[PDB]
Design a protein around this ligand. Sequence first.
Ligand SMILES: [Ca+2]
Ligand SMILES: [Ca+2]
Ligand SMILES: [Zn+2]
Ligand SMILES: [Zn+2]
Lengths: 345, 344, 547, 548
Amino acid sequence: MSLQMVTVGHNIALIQPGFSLMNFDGQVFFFGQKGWPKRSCPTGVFHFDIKQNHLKLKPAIFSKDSCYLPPLRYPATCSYKKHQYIIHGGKTPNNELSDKIYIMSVACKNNKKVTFRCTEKDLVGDVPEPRYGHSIDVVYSRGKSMGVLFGGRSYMPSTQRTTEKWNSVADCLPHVFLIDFEFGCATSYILPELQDGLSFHVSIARNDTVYILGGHSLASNIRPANLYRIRVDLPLGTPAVNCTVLPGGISVSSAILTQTNNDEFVIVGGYQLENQKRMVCSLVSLGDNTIEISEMETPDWTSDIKHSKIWFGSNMGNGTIFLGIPGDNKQAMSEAFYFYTLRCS
Amino acid sequence: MSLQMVTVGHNIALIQPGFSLMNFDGQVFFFGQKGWPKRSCPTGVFHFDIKQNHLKLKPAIFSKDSCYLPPLRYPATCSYKKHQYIIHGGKTPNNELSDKIYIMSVACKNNKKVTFRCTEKDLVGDVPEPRYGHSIDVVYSRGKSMGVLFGGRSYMPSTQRTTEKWNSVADCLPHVFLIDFEFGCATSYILPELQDGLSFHVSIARNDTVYILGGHSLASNIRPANLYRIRVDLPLGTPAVNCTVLPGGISVSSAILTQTNNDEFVIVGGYQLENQKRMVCSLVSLGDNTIEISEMETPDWTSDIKHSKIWFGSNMGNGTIFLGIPGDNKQAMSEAFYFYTLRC
Amino acid sequence: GLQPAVCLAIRVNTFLSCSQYHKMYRTVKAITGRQIFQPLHALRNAEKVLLPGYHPFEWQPPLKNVSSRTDVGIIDGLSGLASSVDEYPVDTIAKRFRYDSALVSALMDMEEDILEGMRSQDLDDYLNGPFTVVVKESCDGMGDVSEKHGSGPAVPEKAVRFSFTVMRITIEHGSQNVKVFEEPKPNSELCCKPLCLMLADESDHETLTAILSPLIAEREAMKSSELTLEMGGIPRTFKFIFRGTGYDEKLVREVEGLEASGSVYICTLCDTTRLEASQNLVFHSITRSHAENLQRYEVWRSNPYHESVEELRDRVKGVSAKPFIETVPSIDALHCDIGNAAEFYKIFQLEIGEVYKHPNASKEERKRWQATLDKHLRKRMNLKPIMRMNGNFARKLMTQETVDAVCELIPSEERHEALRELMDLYLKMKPVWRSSCPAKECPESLCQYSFNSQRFAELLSTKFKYRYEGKITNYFHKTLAHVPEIIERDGSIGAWASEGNESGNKLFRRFRKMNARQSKCYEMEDVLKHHWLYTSKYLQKFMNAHN
Amino acid sequence: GLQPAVCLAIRVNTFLSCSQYHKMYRTVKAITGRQIFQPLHALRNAEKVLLPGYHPFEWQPPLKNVSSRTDVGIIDGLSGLASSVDEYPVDTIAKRFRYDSALVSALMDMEEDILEGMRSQDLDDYLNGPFTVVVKESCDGMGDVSEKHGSGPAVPEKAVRFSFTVMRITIEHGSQNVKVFEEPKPNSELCCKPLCLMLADESDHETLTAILSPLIAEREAMKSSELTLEMGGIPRTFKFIFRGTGYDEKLVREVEGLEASGSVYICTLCDTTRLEASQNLVFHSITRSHAENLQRYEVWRSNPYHESVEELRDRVKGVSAKPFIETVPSIDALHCDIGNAAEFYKIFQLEIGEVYKHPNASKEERKRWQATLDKHLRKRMNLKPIMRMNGNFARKLMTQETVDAVCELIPSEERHEALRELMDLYLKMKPVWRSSCPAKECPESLCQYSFNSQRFAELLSTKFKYRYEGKITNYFHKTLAHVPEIIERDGSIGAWASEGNESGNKLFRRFRKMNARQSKCYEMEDVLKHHWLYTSKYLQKFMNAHNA
DNA sequence: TGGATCTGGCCTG
DNA sequence: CAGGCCAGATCCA
DNA sequence: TGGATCTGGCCTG
DNA sequence: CAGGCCAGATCCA
DNA sequence: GGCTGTATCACTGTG
DNA sequence: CACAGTGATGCAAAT
DNA sequence: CACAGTGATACAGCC
DNA sequence: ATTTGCATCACTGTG
Ligand SMILES: [Ca+2]
Ligand SMILES: [Ca+2]
Ligand SMILES: [Zn+2]
Ligand SMILES: [Zn+2]
């Protein structure tokens, strides 16, 4: 729980709330910049390197067969295990939602340089509507791998959308979707245990189950302290999904999850109410069929973090969490965002 | 006739038109800064130094018995010959004329360190009225040295001054004043050959004669091409002054004088008309009882000088003139003036 | 007398605030005894008539994704953008009209003017043919607007305004089309009707797109529909044509996909690179559009041919973004003039030092040339040096007396002649793209514009060899290539400039501090309302009572 | 039918320009029929009465070094300064009124106010006793004014304004003098009458003195004379007392022959060093004056005791220049507020990071303290960060709410209580040198000012040794040492401040942009005339006729 | 090793 | 954000 | 010795 | 004066 | 009942 | 060829 | 305690 | 013998 200051070079005006950090064999990268890609880095991905508390963003080129994907502002992050990386949905800089699926991998690597491979796929069947703030995970049941998707936030349908409330958003349906990455097919599933919409939640994966906990429901403007376990099996026939409500959950939205130890996760950040801001950390003790959430010591927060409104961040992968605090300079620019790093054992 | 540019330090905003350069044993100094003396240099005099065409205005301290003098804007400078420097008249930063004579000399010198001695001198008798733009010289007649003074520009008399025309100026009377430095006495003389006022002229001195030429008369708003020779003798009785009008003079005002060779001077700079500016240099050759003004080659002036309207300068002493050209930046600060050096 | 409409017209067009008008009315009543000026409540009651959201209108077919209400006025520019803490923060204040309601109110403001124009053409008065209205939309960012204190978001110190003008209104009579309504001063502040006032930065793309998306949606919905309006006791139908010419180069490039403002690709109308533009400079054709930009962005995103970054950029011709506003490929005359005159300014500075003889020079020498040029201009034409160059400076600097004065600083008679002929060629070029009706104002200058173009290009290539091989500026490429094609496509270039938008920016600056309420949450609405009132022909004609 | 005087009053007070008024007049005439308003030529003819140079007057004894003509209006501010190429270059444009003409115009404007005051004071009406007038002169340099095009000198981008206002008028009756006139809003823009507008740098002493010398000459000429003016059918005499208070610290230092602002001798009222001010900070006395400064400059120039630079500076107490403008020693309330509030801002910045435990700090740490203070100040008091601090910021930061907000960031409680009590002391001390009359509305505060100042000094010297050990601000020195003495000497502090001069400075830009010819040779004449018309009191009561 | 020489801090604007 | 004064860290013959 | 890394120039504002 | 792109001088493993 | 008048709200702007 | 000011001055037209 | 706005809103006043 | 209207002059201001 060590909080340490980190500085940024001449690219500090490129990080906004909602970015995504990807880890490839011990190297963490950056995605989701501000504005459309420039001539300095047409690809849009960056080399997120922190050495001696200094963050330098270097461009990373793409492969010849890669797709130059737009900078998404709030996608769903998954880490397929040949180590790939899957993102679905998000917001383009022109503020339209994308229903497209992207797969990222390292095409070829040499000394200190890497070329990525962005691949475009098309989903068929009960394809989810364009949305953002959702979560996607992968399960490994009976030797078959399949992705899972849950609801989020999306614009109003094309038949009930007006220009006065053009940017108004509504929570998606509680439906749970199974995505088959190798075949690009999706099947809808309605679960009676899920009745209200949920967005900006955190997801924890295991061998054959996904633990969704926390989040915000826009219909009632509440942050429920719920916890669902979604278990999926893959027989020869059609897949079967079951959701079980478990007690002892927490109430948080837009929290940050990291990979501390095997079968050990911790949740940092988030918001409890509109003006209330999450100061505590919850340790998730994974298990075979048991879940235990415990609260550890609060990290030594600084005055700037304690007296702010928002922070945003992602997971570095190596037990490190990178969060930033907005500043009041703006007109002076430069120090438009104050960034921090956090270590979990 | 070589023209080079000199850069400046951080005291560029300290030089204004009407400054005076002071020479002692081959070292040139500065006087007549901008504004009242600051704490960076309370004395007001500066070490005017040039190495590789760079200006560094170092301060120069004063002696314990010296008198701290205001920065004068248009004084009358003379180099008395045991080497001192005579200054009389001028304009204070608050725009009042001064009728006091200050005498400057090197009190003591260290390794690249000079301490001056400013002495206040009081004049009795026919003391000249406060003025500026005039000229002062010294003559040596049969073992006696006496200073000569000519008219200039001065404010209107106290009985005819109106706040509407408060800053209006009128030329002084052509009365020639003989001031004796060691006694502090002045005697006025009226010369029939001198009828109109004269100001911003150049003075050339010799053993017992002074050559005044050029200058602007404000009464007629003209610049006469005159050349007067003034002779002074010092018998046992009262001194006798005779003025003779000579031909071949030039018509220039606010010109710069420097000495190139013994019994040899040159006129550089000045004005011909209100908007006409002096592009030619007149080489004057002196003699025992003769004068001769000749025109030398025109130095290669730059476009900035040729297309300007004003320059100002003084004499370094070692055949060098330090003239400046105003810049058009002003608001961008720093380079408010552009400076040049000329070698004779 | 002095009916409330006339009193409101006086108060608006004399730049009188509500408090000052109240003082004048109170003192006039107290002195004269009578009630000459109407009270403020009567003024507001007459005000509600001219504001959008008072007249009944019907769309057929109904607009897609647009409400059918006819009583909507000032609405939040965020358009329901949720300011929840859990998502992207918003730090903008925006107030806007519904664009269809604004069009209806603007059309009914000039109701009697359209009647008079249609009468003067020997047509009937009750004719209800489908009118064809062309609207020029202008958007321009601003800077150095002071942020106010008080509660609210951390609003930046920049402003972006959206406005539109009604230029020409035509009715289909017989077989041909007759011109009914004519704008006499297209570049005036009295015709640039504001639409949306957002207090944000044009550099920021997310907030700009979020705020201007509903307006573009309404425009797209209305581009394929007709409007029925009760005009002068007889229902009439309207169809609209939209022209996005009121943008500058930077805004155009950052909107419709193009990258930066200075790069390998220079023009926003053709796919020409900088090097071959400098090489040819005379022969070109307009190729870029909005659908083409969308297709190019789709190709860039999909990468169908499996190409590397360099050749992919070559294939897409610099388009690496998704366009979201349809911009007409025209030239902004004001900024073209500013850029051309600034470049001739620096050419004068560069010719002072005889660089054609001395290829290498120091920054001190460059500053020397700058100072000499500035001092000589101040001495001769009484100008002053300005950090950023404006239109008045451009107009004063581009005269033959300019080269006459500068030639006193350069010794070469050959350079004198070259600069003089360059000035003459540019002065012959200028009225073609600065006149509001070149076909009836300068046909002699219009006919030989191409020949002047080859002469100008040859002079730049030969006599100014030291600067114009391997590069040439955006606006010179535009002027020497695309002007005749634009002038035959449209009819004029200066009538479709941003002079009216700049004058509206000045009016906004005055109104934000002189006659608007001082609070962060309810000042954009007041400024928008007062500007809409000030740009009303019905109130304007009350100051022209001479007949 | 409206009178030309009423029409001019409307056109002037409602901030209407000539073109807008002309088009309003033409449209009103064309629509209503009968002519309600009056033509621009009628308004122009009706405005020459108010401008100076129309009313006859006679000085006795005649003023020295000034013409006796009584028909002079706008005259050149250069006062016939030599503009030839052989002289010192001039780059300034200035238009000015004659001081006596402006004063007689103001007196004839306030004629009816004086008569009403005499009627209300239970005195007679045709009394012609020696009326005594107290006039406050304020000067201020301006910046960020853009020079125009056109022929003329290389004018600077700075402006200097000279204005005067009339505060008190008294007449002697028997053994006492009555108090017949008072300005209800001494700090308003409607009372400061412009006198001389110039475009010169404030730091350019040469042109500053060149343009301001005739005004000082006229002031000294009329300081010891009698003015006979025809007033309401009976000739009456007038005496004048001149008080120059609307000068900020920089102007006082420059025109009084003092050093720069930093220096060692900090105060313009007492000759005490910065160290001595930080050692005592309470007990002092006013000792500087114009005559004393002149004598000290004479001593500096003469050097009669044969002393070196440091000894001569110690003897002359920093006077190394000749003063040319006589300014009464006082405190400018607006700039005092600004400086004290900025010092409080720095105190808060230091107290956030606990400098009393960390004497060594870095630029990054201080910048972070700046950022967090700005963020929390915005959050709580709705204040945006500003690089140069205004007076509204000072007023809104001189509250208990903002100190509570700052204490929400200080972990310790001792610092909380120290800041709370210090802020309370400052808020108790403030109303004495800010109220227009502090002997009537703040008697208890005036009486307790000395004890509060002593408590403030002790609290600083004890609890804030990291900021005020061996160094303290000259404005704190003034506020803690000289305020009660200035109150006793004058009667009020704040009524003589430069708030009215600042408001006139605000009006200057508006007049230059809207109600003046856009030429380099007429703009200042037009601005001066229009500002005089606006500040005239005969055109203001016509807009208040609804209360009659 | 003791004055020059930048250099940051502080005061008013 | 400039301008001026002063205490402090280098520094060089 | 062949790409990284600043860096000045130039285009629009 | 601020941002973005490009040709050019260092430069380092 | 209806027209007219005035207080109130959180701010600005020259500093 | 941006267009609406900016105000003092002067001469022609109206009562 | 600088002071004159700045416009919409709502309630009091008077015929 | 007045009073009133309109052109003229070199400029500004948003760029
Ligand atoms: Ca613009
Ligand atoms: Ca000031
Ligand atoms: Zn092109
Ligand atoms: Zn003191």
